Amino acid sequence: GLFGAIAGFIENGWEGLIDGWYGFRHQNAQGEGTAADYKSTQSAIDQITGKLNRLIEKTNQQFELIDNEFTEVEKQIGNVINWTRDSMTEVWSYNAELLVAMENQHTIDLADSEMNKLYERVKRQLRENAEEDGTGCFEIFHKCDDDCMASIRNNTYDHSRYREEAMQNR
Amino acid sequence: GLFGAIAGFIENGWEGLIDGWYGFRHQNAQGEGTAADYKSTQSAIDQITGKLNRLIEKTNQQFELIDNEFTEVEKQIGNVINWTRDSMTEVWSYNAELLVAMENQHTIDLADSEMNKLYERVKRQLRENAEEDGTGCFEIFHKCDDDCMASIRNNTYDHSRYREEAMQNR
Amino acid sequence: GLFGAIAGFIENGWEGLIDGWYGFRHQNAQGEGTAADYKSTQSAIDQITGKLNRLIEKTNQQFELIDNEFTEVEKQIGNVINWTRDSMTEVWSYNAELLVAMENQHTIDLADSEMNKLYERVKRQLRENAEEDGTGCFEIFHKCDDDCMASIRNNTYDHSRYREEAMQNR
Amino acid sequence: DKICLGHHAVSNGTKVNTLTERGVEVVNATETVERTNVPRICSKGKRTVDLGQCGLLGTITGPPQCDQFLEFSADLIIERREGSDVCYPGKFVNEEALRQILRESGGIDKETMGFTYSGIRTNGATSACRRSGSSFYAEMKWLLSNTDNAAFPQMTKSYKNTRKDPALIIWGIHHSGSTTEQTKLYGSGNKLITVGSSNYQQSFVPSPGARPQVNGQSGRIDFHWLMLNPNDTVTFSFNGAFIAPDRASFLRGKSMGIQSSVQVDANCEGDCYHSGGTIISNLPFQNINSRAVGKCPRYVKQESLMLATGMKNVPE
Amino acid sequence: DKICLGHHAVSNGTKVNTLTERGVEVVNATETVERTNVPRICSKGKRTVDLGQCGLLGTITGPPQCDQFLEFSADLIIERREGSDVCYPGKFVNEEALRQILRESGGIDKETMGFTYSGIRTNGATSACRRSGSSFYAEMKWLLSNTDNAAFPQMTKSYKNTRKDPALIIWGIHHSGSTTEQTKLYGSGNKLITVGSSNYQQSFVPSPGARPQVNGQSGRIDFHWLMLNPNDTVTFSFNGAFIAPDRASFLRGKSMGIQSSVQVDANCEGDCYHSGGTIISNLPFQNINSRAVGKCPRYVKQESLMLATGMKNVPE
Amino acid sequence: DKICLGHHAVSNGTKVNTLTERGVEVVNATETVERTNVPRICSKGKRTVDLGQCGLLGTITGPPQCDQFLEFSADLIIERREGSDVCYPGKFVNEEALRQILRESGGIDKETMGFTYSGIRTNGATSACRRSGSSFYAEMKWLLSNTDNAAFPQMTKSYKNTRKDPALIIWGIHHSGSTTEQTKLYGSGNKLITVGSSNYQQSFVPSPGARPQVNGQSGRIDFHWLMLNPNDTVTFSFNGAFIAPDRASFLRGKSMGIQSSVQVDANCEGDCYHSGGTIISNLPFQNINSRAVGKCPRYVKQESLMLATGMKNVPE
Numbered sequence A, B, C: 001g002l003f004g005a006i007a008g009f010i011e012n013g014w015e016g017l018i019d020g021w022y023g024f025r026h027q028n029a030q031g032e033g034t035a036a037d038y039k040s041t042q043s044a045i046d047q048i049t050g051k052l053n054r055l056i057e058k059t060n061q062q063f064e065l066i067d068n069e070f071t072e073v074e075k076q077i078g079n080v081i082n083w084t085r086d087s088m089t090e091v092w093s094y095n096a097e098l099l100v101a102m103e104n105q106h107t108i109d110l111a112d113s114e115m116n117k118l119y120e121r122v123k124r125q126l127r128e129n130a131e132e133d134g135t136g137c138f139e140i141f142h143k144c145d146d147d148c149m150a151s152i153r154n155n156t157y158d159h160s161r162y163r164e165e166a167m168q169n170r
Numbered sequence D, E, F: 001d002k003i004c005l006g007h008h009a010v011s012n013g014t015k016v017n018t019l020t021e022r023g024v025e026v027v028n029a030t031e032t033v034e035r036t037n038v039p040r041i042c043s044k045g046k047r048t049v050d051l052g053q054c055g056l057l058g059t060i061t062g063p064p065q066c067d068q069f070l071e072f073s074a075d076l077i078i079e080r081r082e083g084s085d086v087c088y089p090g091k092f093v094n095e096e097a098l099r100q101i102l103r104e105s106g107g108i109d110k111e112t113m114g115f116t117y118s119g120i121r122t123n124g125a126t127s128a129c130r131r132s133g134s135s136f137y138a139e140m141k142w143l144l145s146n147t148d149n150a151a152f153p154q155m156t157k158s159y160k161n162t163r164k165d166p167a168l169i170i171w172g173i174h175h176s177g178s179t180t181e182q183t184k185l186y187g188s189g190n191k192l193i194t195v196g197s198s199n200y201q202q203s204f205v206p207s208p209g210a211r212p213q214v215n216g217q218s219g220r221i222d223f224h225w226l227m228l229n230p231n232d233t234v235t236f237s238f239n240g241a242f243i244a245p246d247r248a249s250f251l252r253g254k255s256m257g258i259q260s261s262v263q264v265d266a267n268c269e270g271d272c273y274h275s276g277g278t279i280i281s282n283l284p285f286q287n288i289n290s291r292a293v294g295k296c297p298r299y300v301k302q303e304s305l306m307l308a309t310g311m312k313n314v315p316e
Ligand SMILES: CC(=O)N[C@@H]1[C@@H](O)[C@H](O[C@@H]2O[C@H](CO)[C@H](O)[C@H](O[C@]3(C(=O)O)C[C@H](O)[C@@H](NC(C)=O)[C@H]([C@H](O)[C@H](O)CO)O3)[C@H]2O)[C@@H](CO)O[C@H]1O
Pocket: D123, D124, D125, D126, D127, D128, D134, D142, D144, D175, D176, D177, D181, D185, D216, D217, D218, D219, D220
């Protein structure tokens, strides 16, 4: 996509993540752990949802028969009707091909975008207390236990607390 | 939006800013101060303007009457005309709904984008002389007076001058 | 564009680069050197290519004559046909103007995007071993010879090797 | 020591298309083009009239098979292939226009023209049009000369529309199989039938002559019509060969008319109909039938167009 | 110690719609669908002809109310509801086609056919068509037998178009109220009126018979027409019942024709017109009238479609 | 000390348009609107019939210039301006409908009606229709009274379609230059020509009268037609003035018909045709001709619409 996270600096997706669209895996003294992020997952879901509610629509626009399957109408008017109907088929087939291609390009870039947002939101929380791996990973200098991890997810992680020790560990 | 600044890492907008679309507030020894950024404001304005000049258009395409309000035309041809007109109403109503939705999605992401550009342009000026707050704020280690602030806006801010003192203040 | 690299923090393009769309110039002890990046260049090319293959199409949709250049049809039906044809000309002219404007906006932002991806991919490789100039330039603290440069392009550059010396050179 | 961001993925994704690419695999997607048809006319909650053997136009003139449809009332009118507008062989001039009027009519209400006659037969009949032996169109009268070969006296009959809505007036011209048959029914001489309104002007002549027998008759009755405006008059002046209306028709309101070959079903509701049935769908497009009528998804040529409802799928 | 980036916001934003959302609030927006109508025909700078009582088709035949419109010249032609094409009751065959030709004509120029006559009355008149007592169509001649019941001698009249543009030729067939009235005017016997060109072939017969009185007349005049090409000839052969053209018409150039119920106004300029007036707008769309003609914004069903002209509004 | 990222650029870029801007310069672009025409009919690999002097409708009746096109067979049919449907002056009723049928026919196959005659001339001819002296339509028969002024005996002829596809039946009504000429050919008295099917009902009368001479003839032959369904019968009953079909026509399959003024060329293949030639293009749009037919790019008003195929061009 445009933002370069999904099928980008992230190598690949996680078949193990079943609670959301985006999440975190960590490694620390106590072990490994995965968890879904509700906020990022919700924005994407709600937006894709909003798309569907616009498109899964049908008009209150009625049309009646202007020709006849049982007794053919006069040939000249018959051909003008067919020509017009075929002209409309062409227009709507184009519209529909484009609509869907345009929406899909955008849906994908929306997903790619929501990840990139989540990435950099965390980055900023950490400040000088961690560095950028490049594969979607944040290496932490100070050791960070499972309570310390849940505070990162919660957006309650206090960088100043662990700062001194992490900066000396540059 | 896609870039995640407006209704993103920035908490909210500033009703006090009346000189432009984007700007800076600072805090220093001399006091607080707000100022609009001409460049970022101009790019957004000019682009939204360019949109309007494409859409606020009308064709030189003339059409004449093919029916009659005073003396109804023959019913068969009358129904084909109505069917065709209604077919065109359907197409143009769709076109217009889509056009406006597509342009608005893009207009919003353009505004969100111009902010994110301005953010990171400043970030780069500062280099190791400041850190990222996360709320759209750049904490400066070295003390920076009102002349020092105007040089940031002007894009004349010399990072090397204040470097030594700011890096030691890590 | 939306990402702010091309006609953005990069001052301007390079007429000297003929092997690709994106690349690197470096400065070091041995001299200056330019080289095209195959990956970034390929993604843009393949995507713009994919666009052309969708649009450079033509329908298998046949239409026949419903009027006559040699012997004018009856005037009423003649006017309905012309009205309809002119209605279709209006629709397709609009479609085509929009399609091309929409695709071009996107093509430009795609190019701008692929650069910004390449930029930040390198940034991450370097980590604390270099700083951000702002003009699209990465200033390196440790001295880096032509073998060291080719490893950056190759994505084989080992940051940990040159780390100690570069961090002390903060 | 570290924390890592990621996104979900699945084993089996679903392919969609984009501006830039064909066959991009995404986590989930959903169809925008309807392919599923219901092979019935879904008529739940609608006043329906399935004409069966009765042809739409026959509801106005009244051949035997339309005896139960002379004053119907409907939201949805269903014409069938086996339907026929006539008993005695013939045709409506401007037939499709009238069908379109009737399909949208909501049904019809009838009133007598109040035409009386004297010194003529009023009761002409045929075996082509049978109701326990020979009969005729239930709304029409076959006007004849009293006795064989007798001259048909030059008549003038008139009807004013006293109603607030327009009336539908019908008449018929009879074309005998031979000139000698024409003289037998309405006396000799060139017959003129005149018809006029304030809105309308026309005239007619019969055309006796050999035709192939249809329902065992080589004669023909041409039916004609006009829409008489509120508080306007129509006058019929005729030498003979003339099939007079017994009643005038009035439109009840609004309806939708369709043509179909499948059954009615009151268990199923739908607003998009075609000859093969009903398209029940929320989707914007459909690839089932380009002549579907009602409130329909737009017809498109593509069999499928998948709309992504998930991110790009990138498995290991 | 610090510096902070931000964007503007307002107290009262304006809601718009997006691909993804309905009712997103943005700083400013502007309407793309026109709802404002001007209830006048904005005719500033245009040669205008408001036909009033004169019907468009009447400019060719010339009933009293069209006496001032026999050779008009125009950029914009305005038909009114009260307009009438006729004095003596009747109709044009192919009437809407001719109107379309005339609406786009730029006006008309006339030339005499140069038809002379002998041994007949040329001066037929009626009280239905009054100019200080009884008169007739100003461009037409009611041709009669010299005296009552006298036979109408078999005539042949011809006209060649010597001009570089096509000519508009008109004639009329007269249908008496009765057969006995027809014989009185043009003698007895079945009357044939023939009309031919190199491009065109047709024939006509009268149809005497009772009709409801319109302008106190139960007779009718059918008007017919054709477009004669440069350097082609038309021949009229007639037993009677025939209303001959006195003049031929030629189209001046280009115009636009409209139908309206509102006043002319030379203070206001516009190119998109409809019966209720003029749509003056730069906007691409309009929700005012789907039958607007001229150079119009496209008609759409939506009452409003707001185009964002500002960022998302995010107040505290 | 350092490394720098960059992108390419060119000296001379190409301007395109965007949602936001007009005239943005990009590295490279390509045209989406076709302006290049091939001034020939590109017929490579297609069974082509260029009618030249023969008019499409003339292939059914057979005037001299259509003698080589009586049973043609084609994928692509080309009508020319100089083409004419007739030798003896006249016209087809419903002419454009029939052309549309024939253009799409794939050609025609003929079979005899099997009509024999007795006690009449069958061999009428004219100098307007010459094949080494005077002749007639090759598929038609000009039926006359045996000798001058002799009465034309009241005939009835019939034809059943035994084929699985519909037949195309044609006949003609002859209108003499004068009433006295009509009596000479087919005896005096008002002539009636009747024509009926199970699907179709109509009647005709001649109309003798003066017309301008076309091909030195002031008479006219009106041609009529109908599509007879498989296993249905048509009956012709006629007092005279009647031009009988000698053969029936059947459609071979599928074709495309065009009108053009340029040459055929079998070196060039194309599916989008117009009077000025062929549009060979992969592009989605075209600004060459709005009446192009076949499989065409969509016609648009814009002369050019450039699609960017490169990044924004930013030189120093
Ligand atoms: C030589 C001989 O005696 N032959 C008879 C033969 O006439 C007869 O057929 C009759 O053919 C006439 C048409 O010429 C009609 O079709 C007769 O039927 C009816 C009908 O059923 O429609 C009878 C009906 O009462 C008539 N009604 C009126 C009001 O006139 C109609 C009417 O004349 C026609 O429909 C108008 O076209 O005709 C039919 O019996 C055959 C049996 O078919 O018997 C031979 O012996």
